[model samples]
Target: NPTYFFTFGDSYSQTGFSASGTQPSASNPMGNPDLGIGTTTNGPNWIGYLTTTENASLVLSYNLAAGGATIDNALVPAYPGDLASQFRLFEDVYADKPASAPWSAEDAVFGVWIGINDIGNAYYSTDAETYTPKLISRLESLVEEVYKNGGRKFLFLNVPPTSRSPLFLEQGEEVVKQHAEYLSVYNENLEGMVDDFTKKKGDVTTVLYDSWSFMTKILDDPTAYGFPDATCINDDGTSCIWWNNYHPGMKYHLLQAEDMKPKLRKLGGW
Candidate 1:
């Protein structure tokens, strides 16, 4: 049996997924040219790893994500980098049915992992009040549109703790604390929004993946998951905390998949 996995998000999820269809495998999960798609982390990101998993191989996946995406279109005006545009692209593909792909309410599970750029830009500008609610409203609209189009099961991943990131920590102590508060306030609203979404849908199965707390656990105890604490890159990524300035290395991504696996199965019997 095949379960269709449709994904939307920012740099974290964008592995150059084409709606026209591309088969992802162990050697090439993103299905892009010249060593494959743009990404912050090393090797296949979460979506890539998930698709290749024993359980996830049964999934026919489509990732329409782009880097630097935001729920607020005005805040992130570049069309492809906006979640709304990503949804529109998916809608177009669904309407076209290129391979005459099989899609049904039960056959598909939608994954939305967003809000990094949106929150970061807004918080830094000290304009959280203006855009936070807008982001929430936009997310509600996004899900409703998909649900209306016969989509039911949904996965919503929240923002990770960027306040602890190498770049953020470089900005000195007060800035870090301020941004942490920014993140907390936004996450609170996002969780509340998820509850509202579930209640409003009534029939849809939606999961609120708490990426913040999840990543924090790994950050606090990297050795538990076979990673070094607060270290930079080496020849291998299994020990490094971060691959680069912002993104975590391969080990964290692997752990994330392990954590998410059972939750996904609970949602779709994957």
Candidate 2:
């Protein structure tokens, strides 16, 4: 049986906007350019498309990862619905019952890479908690919702080493130092959380693709990755003079595809 993919998150899985781009207001600085997504402009995105390319019988995949989405959005219905909103797409699918719609539990594979945007927002608002069970509950609930949706195998990507983002670079050396120290602990906590999730949910094939580990390794040691300067690796494309520190580039996303390929393949039995 071919694996049918259901994605949920921000632009990391966005194929297009049903309405508009991320720009909140007309003056919103963030612009919408394809952030090195999909095999074709109209086809599956990195993971969504790449997975299909790896298997002969596989057709292609679907992506629901949108830009600027949050966990709360997934459970609740918000404009541009958060993680919850994307999942609601399932409800709509069942209600409308489109011809040839994907609505069953057979041979379904789920992939999600979200929450980094939430952390960035929280940090910017100075609301990032060092520890909180509520936060833990929310993350677990999100994953649990996916499981309830009939997801058997899961591939989850954790938040990146955010302090290393280009946003922190302009913070001066001291702030940068503090953030680097801070997020390392955060990633460690995230890893532990995944460990805990796996312990409780026995049959769920849950794997955390550590974006922080892979990305920070380069930041921690850039030259080893062939970059002369770690900070110069690449910014999201937002900064002074149109700098984007939030997102990564095609090369990096491709690297993600490579690193995540084997795990996803095994799950899909590709």
Candidate 3:
């Protein structure tokens, strides 16, 4: 049986996929002029890389993600498919596919990678008091819904260190530090939520991909990955590590696909 990947997240995981009719394809999934059918990056993101390079069978990816989407649509305005909204879409399409997209929950993998906007918003809003608890609760509920819906395998990606991003770094040390602290708290709570979900829902498999640590390794040693200087991106199009102010380049996505392939295979028997 093929692994039908149903992704839900923010811009990082968004492949510009709308469920109207289109099937997932590498060439045009991002839909960006430079990136071509994916996010605003230089090339295909992780989803593209997975389907194109890692899949053993024909991969059917329903990327129900949108730009500027938060978990609850509290801070960032909902862009059609927010966290809860995307899950609603999942429930709709899971039972019935849009023609030739038939897939059973037994063979489907739900991938979720979000929360940059949520943490970024906290920097300005300064509402960690209420934010952390609410976020954790929402995550727990989201996983519970999927588990009840017959989704047994799950993949969760923690937010990366966006404070080190080109856009966030320009804001200076204090601003970057502030947001980073909040984001760290969110990541911790997120892991806790995953733990809670696994304990509560027995016989289910879940893998929390540590994206924060992965990106941090590259940022510290960019030269090892071909970036001579970590700060300044020598634009070689999609291959560059940092694609402008936000988003990683194709090389970064490629590295992610390589590192995650084995982990995903081991965790979910992909």
Candidate 4:
């Protein structure tokens, strides 16, 4: 029951990565913590609200993610705030000697939910083809790094279908199409990474959770997926949409946990 859960990737994995929620100017301040982790239920992040983490009176969970991270940071030096920095953050997790309880390899679980931001930016910059190969190579190094850290249990989620974002819908067909094209290539790299991981680490216990497929399923039929009810923040008088452009709300995260349940089960049980 000492199995520790480690999280990586982007905002979906962030504990209190942003300070945008709290109402403020003086009292609230900008660095107001996220609603996740030990924060308010009105606030718990994607992972914070999971049964696994909450019921972890026995199971331990650890997260190593930042608000905005990318695969590029993993392959090479990350920007000031990126995935590579999170890797360094992981190392820092063990930086100071613990006075009471220390960390061990046996009590660990790792989850990676990155790569989408790369595509997002690529779309903005119009560099899909140029970035795909670079990202592929980057993911390879990230996986290897995790393995080197004695992390055997891994849960890898693919990039979400960002073309379905509110911004794209608002931008009209051409811009959305351009972003979609890049996302498609990005997913190609995503699938390639999955195949590569499975082939190379056949003996390793790794699971590939298709965020792409899952999101696509929802996008193809938002009503069917409860998106209209949950994430469709636009209230014609009924449901609400949490997303302004690219990010989602708690409702979406709840849906994600459901979408991600099958793969989450592979993390050695609660």
Ranking of models by lDDT: 3, 1, 4, 2
lDDT of 2 at 270: 49
TM-score of structure candidate 3? 0.88
Two-way lDDT contest, 1 vs 4, winner:
1
* Span of 10 residues, lowest total lDDT, candidate 4: 23-32
Off by more than 4 A, model 3: 24-36, 75-78, 95-99, 233-239, 267-269
Clashes of each: 0, 21, 6, 11
> What are the clashing pairs of model 1?
none
- Find the 10 residues in a row with the least total lDDT in model 1: 28-37
Local accuracy by lDDT, each model: 0.73, 0.54, 0.74, 0.59
RMSD of 2: 7.5
Across 1-270, the per-residue lDDT of candidate 2 in tens digits comes to 445555667755565533234421222211233323332222234564345444434432445566677666433223475776666664455223234334344456676766665555454334235432334456667677767766667667777766666667777777666555545544566667777877877766667788777777766775665556555533432111111454555445555566667756556534
Residue 91 CA displacement from its true place in model 3, Å: 2.3
Using lDDT as the measure, name the better of candidate 2 and candidate 3.
Answer: 3
Clashing pairs in 3: 29-37, 30-37, 30-38, 31-37, 31-38, 32-37
Task: Estimate, for each residue in 1-270, the C-alpha lDDT of model 4 and write its tens digit.
Answer: 344556677765666533223321222111235334432123455565553433323343455566667766544333455766666666665323232114344545577888767776667665777768787777667667767766667677777777777756778778878888888787777777777776787646677777777666666776774555433554221233344456665555667666666565556633
State which candidate, 3 or 4, has the greater lDDT: 3
Q: Highest lDDT among the candidates is held by which one?
A: 3
* Per-model TM against the reference: 0.88, 0.71, 0.88, 0.76
Model 3, 1-270: lDDT tens digits are 456788888888776776665555444432222234556556677887776677665566778888878887654544666798888887776645444455555667888998887787766676665677687688678767877777788899999989898889999988889888888888888898888787877777788899999988998998888876556653443545777667777778788878788878744424
Alpha-carbon shift of residue 50 in model 3 (angstroms): 1.1
